[PDB]
């Protein structure tokens, strides 16, 4: 389908205990490929996907530098927020950004974004025209005025529309053998009594990539979603994802119920029964 590169910064202050912590994670689609964690005597941008071995060694030095500088500005930003919101120096607070670009399967750009949060709430966001801002409150309006006066939106649009897209295409090629092979789910259903009258059927989908999936129970061929328990998609730990959907049924009625598994690595949707 489409593809994305996404970055997520987290900055957390710790009054009394030294400098804020600062973490970057970077994703292509549903696979993390880099990390930066300031909690080291000499922190480095580090690979988190093996195809990242294909970059030039300067990449790590250059990305490490940018991570370190970004950590410094977020330590200033944390302090600035204390002034904007008239908060004391005593408590720990959080800054976050996320940004990325999206691309069709053919590599054509179609969406970029950039958003900021303070203490877990929207702070300021780049609008979808990528030329204007939405401030969540009067505190953030300070930042909106600042960034409008300084034409920051254009620097954001420059990166999101060009270098973001170019690098995304380069990583997709770099990691084609994994990034672009969809692992289909390995599915199966299990049987566990509820009453002596009732039993629960659970439909498992394991080991699939990417993360988007459709797991539904049908009774007599029509969808049953007001009686299905459906856990959130969860990581396997090896880069694959997991999900299950369950439904309680009267005894004997098992052949009425079917499980429909739709996923991009499946030539056609799977149908399973007990």
């Amino acid at each position: 389908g489409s593809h994305s590169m996404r970055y997520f910064y987290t900055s957390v202050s710790r009054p009394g205990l030294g400098e804020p912590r600062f973490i970057i994670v970077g994703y292509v689609d549903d696979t993390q490929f880099v990390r930066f964690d300031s909690d080291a005597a000499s922190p480095r941008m580090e690979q988190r996907a093996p195809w990242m071995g294909q970059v030039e060694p300067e990449y790590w030095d250059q990305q490490t530098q940018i991570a370190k500088d970004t950590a410094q500005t977020f330590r200033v930003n944390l302090n600035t927020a204390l002034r904007y919101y008239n908060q004391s120096a005593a408590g720990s607070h959080t800054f976050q950004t996320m940004f990325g670009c999206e691309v069709w399967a053919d590599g054509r750009f179609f969406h970029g974004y950039r958003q900021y949060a303070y203490d877990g709430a929207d702070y300021i966001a780049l609008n979808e025209d990528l030329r204007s801002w939405t401030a969540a409150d009067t505190a953030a309006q300070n930042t909106q005025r600042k960034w409008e006066a300084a034409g920051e939106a254009e620097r954001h649009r420059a990166y999101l529309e060009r270098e973001c897209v170019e690098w995304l295409r380069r990583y997709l090629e770099m990691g084609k053998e994994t990034l672009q092979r969809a692992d289909p789910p390995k599915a199966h259903v299990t049987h566990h009594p509820a009453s002596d009258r009732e039993a629960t059927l659970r439909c498992w989908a394991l080991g699939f990539y990417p993360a988007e999936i459709s797991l539904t129970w049908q009774r007599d061929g029509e969808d049953q979603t007001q009686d299905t328990e459906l856990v959130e998609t969860r990581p396997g730990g090896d880069g694959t994802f997991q999900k299950w959907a369950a439904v309680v049924v009267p005894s004997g009625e098992e052949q009425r119920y079917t499980c429909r598994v739709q996923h991009e690595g499946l030539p056609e949707p799977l149908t399973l029964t007990w």
Partner: protein
Amino acid sequence: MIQRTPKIQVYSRHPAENGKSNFLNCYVSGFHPSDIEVDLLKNGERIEKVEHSDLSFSKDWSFYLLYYTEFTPTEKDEYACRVNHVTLSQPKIVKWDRDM
């Protein structure tokens, strides 16, 4: 400030089979702020070797982490995940159930 209480799912990487090595996963998500303490327990006792994914977060800004360890399930050994967070009055303990 916004504060969101963590969701907790405990599960194995592959379907449990007694005597076959596996990965015990505890996946905490939807929480805020990010300070959190996660222990994996074997019969009530802390497991020393535990690792976790890099701190990330979702579209609504809330954080998630995967904690995990290699283990070999048996029939008698009970496993659990113990989570502590500012939103919780005491550590929340979610037991591992190989059927979910």
